[PDB]
Paper text:
[name] from [name] ([name] or PfIspC) is a homodimeric enzyme, with each subunit consisting of 488 amino acid residues. The enzyme [name] is also known as IspC, derived from the gene name ispC in the isoprenoid biosynthesis pathway. It is the enzyme responsible for the second step of a six-step catalytic reaction sequence catalyzing the conversion of the substrate 1-deoxy-d-xylulose 5-phosphate (DOXP) to 2-C-methyl-d-erythritol 4-phosphate (MEP) in the non-mevalonate pathway (MEP pathway). For the catalytic function of [name], one molecule of NADPH and one divalent metal ion (either [name]+ or Mg2+) are required per subunit as cofactors.
Additionally, Trp296 exhibited two conformers, corresponding to the two conformers observed for [name]. The side chain of Trp296 involved in the recognition of the bent conformer of [name] exhibited a similar conformation to that in the MAMK89 complex. In the case of [name], the phenyl moiety of the N-phenylbutyl substituent was somewhat exposed to the protein surface, attributed to the two-carbon extension of the linker length of the N-substituent relative to MAMK150. Additionally, the terminal end of the N-phenylbutyl substituent in [name] displayed a degree of flexibility. The temperature factor of the phenyl moiety of the N-phenylbutyl substituent in [name] was higher than that of the core part of [name], and the electron density of the phenyl moiety was found to be relatively weak.
Author numbering:
A (entry chain B), B (entry chain A): 76 to 292, 296 to 486
Amino acid sequence: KPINVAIFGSTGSIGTNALNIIRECNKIENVFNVKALYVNKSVNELYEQAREFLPEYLCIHDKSVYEELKELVKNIKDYKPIILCGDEGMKEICSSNSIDKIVIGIDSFQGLYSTMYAIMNNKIVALANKESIVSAGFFLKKLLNIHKNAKIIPVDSEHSAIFQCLDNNKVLKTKCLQDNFSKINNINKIFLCSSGGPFQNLTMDELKNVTSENALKWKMGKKITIDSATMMNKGLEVIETHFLFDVDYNDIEVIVHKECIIHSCVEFIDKSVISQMYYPDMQIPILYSLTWPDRIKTNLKPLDLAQVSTLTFHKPSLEHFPCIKLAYQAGIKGNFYPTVLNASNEIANNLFLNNKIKYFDISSIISQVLESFNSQKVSENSEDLMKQILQIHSWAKDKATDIYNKHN
Amino acid sequence: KPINVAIFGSTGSIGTNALNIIRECNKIENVFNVKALYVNKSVNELYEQAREFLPEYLCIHDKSVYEELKELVKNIKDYKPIILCGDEGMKEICSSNSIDKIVIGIDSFQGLYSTMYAIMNNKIVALANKESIVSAGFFLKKLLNIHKNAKIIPVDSEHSAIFQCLDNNKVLKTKCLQDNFSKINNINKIFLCSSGGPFQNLTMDELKNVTSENALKWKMGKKITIDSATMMNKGLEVIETHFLFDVDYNDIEVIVHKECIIHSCVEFIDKSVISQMYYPDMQIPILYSLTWPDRIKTNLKPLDLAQVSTLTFHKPSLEHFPCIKLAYQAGIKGNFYPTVLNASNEIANNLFLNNKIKYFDISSIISQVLESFNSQKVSENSEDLMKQILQIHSWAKDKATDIYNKHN
Ligand SMILES: O=C(CC[C@@H](c1ccccc1)P(=O)(O)O)N(O)CCCCc1ccccc1
Ligand SMILES: O=C(CC[C@@H](c1ccccc1)P(=O)(O)O)N(O)CCCCc1ccccc1
Ligand SMILES: [Ca+2]
Ligand SMILES: [Ca+2]
Ligand SMILES: [Ca+2]
Ligand SMILES: [Mn+2]
Ligand SMILES: [Mn+2]
C-alpha cells in the first residue's frame, strides 16, 4: 500500500528535499516507505539519515569510506541494514523487488548509470539529473522501449510543470521519451520559462566583465548557478524538453519570466495554453514525481497571486546569451552533439567558476568543440552505445581543455 | 466518427460563435455535423444558416413566423428538413437519437427548460447560461442523478478554464454538478479571474453617481455589461463555481486580472496551481465543450506571451463592489437564496440600466430582498422542486419591484 522508494544522492539538494516532503507526508499515515539511501561519499550525513529513516539498504559509492559507514551504523541499536558500496551496490538496490520508485538526484557517471539500471529493472524513475537526458537521450529512449514497465517522470521544475499541464488521461496512454508522445497529448508548442539569471539586464559592455563571484552573489549549487547565469541551463533544458515530450526544437520557445511564478506552459493544438504556477519550489515537483498520477495534500503556503501582483515575460537576447543558440544547434544536429555540448560546457563552466576565462570565452570554447566533433554512426548494441557516449564525453572534455590551454 | 450537434439559440452570441468555430474547424477536417438549429424569432437569419449547414432539423419558437420559415426553406434545393415550432419542437430535437451534444445559448424559461429536456434525453449539454445554474442548481443536480448518462459541460469562460485545467482520468470518474467533484479531482481552491469592469479606479463618491451610460460605453449584451460593472457577474460566477465543481465558498477567491489572459486557476491539494490562458475569446470555451475529452486543431492566432509582456492581479474592493459580498452571503446561506439573488438582481440591473436607480441602490435592493426571504423546505420531488424555484423566482422579482416602488 505504501509507495516503496529509493533515494539516490540522498544528502544532495534533491535528496534532502525529497526526505523532507516524505517525512511530512508520513506524519499520520504510512504513505511512503524509504527502502534505500545512496550517496557518493558523504558518510557522516548518510549515517544521520539512516538513524532517522532506518532504510533496508544503505549504499556509498566511494569504497574508501565503506568501513567508516559500517562502523558508524553499528551504533544504531536494533538495526541490521544491507550495507553496500560502489556500482555493484547500486545495481543490487535497483534489482530489489521491494523498490517501486527511484529518485535520481546524483549527476555525472553515477547519475547516468543509476538511471540506466533503474530502467533495466522496470522501475519508476523520478529523474532530477537533466544532464543524463542531454548526454544520453537517444540511449534512454532505446532502453525505455525495451523495458516496457519503466518510466521516467520529470523532476526538473520546468519539465514537472509541463508534465502537470498535460491531461493525465492522455499521458497514461504513453510515457515520457516515447515516440509520438506530443501527438497523443495534442501538444503544439512549449513555453519554457527561465529566471533569466543575474546577468539578464546587463549591457554587452558590462556583460564582458562579469565574473563568477558576480554570478554567485535564489541559492543553488555552483555549477547550476553558473549555467543559470550564461543561460546554458536553459539550453540544456530545451534539449531535455525535446526528449521527454517528443516536441520539435522549432516548437520550444524560451521565455524569461523573472518573478519565477509561472514555471512553464503548454500550448495545445486548439491554441489553448495551460500553465503551472507556484512559488519557486522543489517540493511540489519532487512530490508529484512520487505520487503521479495522484496528488496528495501538503502544508505548503498557498500562492497569493494578489500579493505577487505582477508577472512579466520577454524573449532572451541570443547575442547576450549565446549558449542558448549553441544548445539549439546541437539539439537540431542530434547524433552525439548534445553529449559534446554537455561535456564541453562542464569544462567551460568550471574554468569560469575558477576565474580562468571570461564570460564570452564559455560559449567560444563550447562552439569550437562542437565544430571539431564529427558525427559517428550510432551503435545498435546497448552496451556499445553506452561505451560510445563515454568515449565522446571524455573526448569533448579533453578537447575543451586543449582549446583553453592553447589560448592560455 | 463525427460530432453531432444541435445549437439552441443559434442567432445569439453563443450560437453564432459556435457556428463560427465549427465552420473554421470543418475547413481543416470535417468533424462536426450540425443536426439541428433552434431560434426564438429571427426567421430570416435561420434560413441563411440552414442554407449553409443543412441540418436535419429546424425549429422556431414563435409560431407567428413558423409558416414564413417553411416558405423560405422550399428555395433550398434537394433539402427536406423537419421544420418544427415552439416547446414541442425543442422536445422533439432533444429526443433525437441522431444528436449527441446540445449547445444551450438561450436564457430565461426556455433556457432552463431546454436544458432540462436535454438532460432528460441523456445528452451532453454545453451550457453557457450561468443564471440557470445559479437559480436552479438543485433541480439540475437532481436531474443529473436521475439521468446518469447526461452531462453538463461548462462554456462560461472562467468555468471552461477551470475545467480545462483538470485531469480527465479523474473527471471521468464523476461529472460536473456532482457532490464530491472537487474531492475526486483533488481540488483545494479556485482563483476566479475577472476583468474588473469599467469602475476599478473609481472612488466611492464617483460610484455614487455613475450611470448605465458610463457602464455601457470588450463588447457584450447590456445585462451582462451592467453585471460586469457592479461585479455581480462575478458574484453569480462564484455560485456557478460552487455548483459545477462542489468547491466550498471559502475556497473561491475572486481576483481582478485586467489583461484577461489568465482565464481562471485551480489550486490542487498539494498547492500546485494550474491555469488556462489565451486571448479573450469565446471560441475556445465553446469548442472545448464540443470536443471534450479531446482537443482538435484550430487556426486561431497563437498566444504571444512576450508581446503580452505584463499580467496583473489585485483583490477587488468589497466596499466598492458590494454585490460580490451579497453573492457570497447568499451562496453560503444556500437553500434558495441563490434563486432570490439572481431574480432580485435581474430587476435591479434593469432599474439601473433604465436610469431609475443609482449604483448603490442595486445592492441595497438585492440585500433587502434577501433579508425578507425565509428558507424553504427543499422538495424531494423533482416536479415540486421546479415549481418551488419558479415560485421563489417570481416572488423575488416582485419583492425587488415593491422595494423600488415603496422608496420611489
Ligand atoms: O533549473 C533550475 C535552476 C535554474 C533556473 C531557475 C532559477 C531560479 C528560479 C527558477 C528557475 P533558470 O531559469 O535560471 O535556468 N530550476 O529548475 C530550479 C528550481 C529551483 C526553485 C527554487 C527552490 C528554492 C528556492 C528558490 C528557487
Ligand atoms: O463573464 C464574462 C463577461 C464578464 C467578465 C469578463 C469581461 C471581459 C473579459 C473577461 C471577462 P467579468 O470578469 O467582467 O465579470 N465572460 O465569461 C466573458 C467572456 C468573453 C471574453 C471576450 C470575448 C471577446 C471579446 C472580449 C472578451
Ligand atoms: Ca577510509
Ligand atoms: Ca494535468
Ligand atoms: Ca509543429
Ligand atoms: Mn530547471
Ligand atoms: Mn464569465
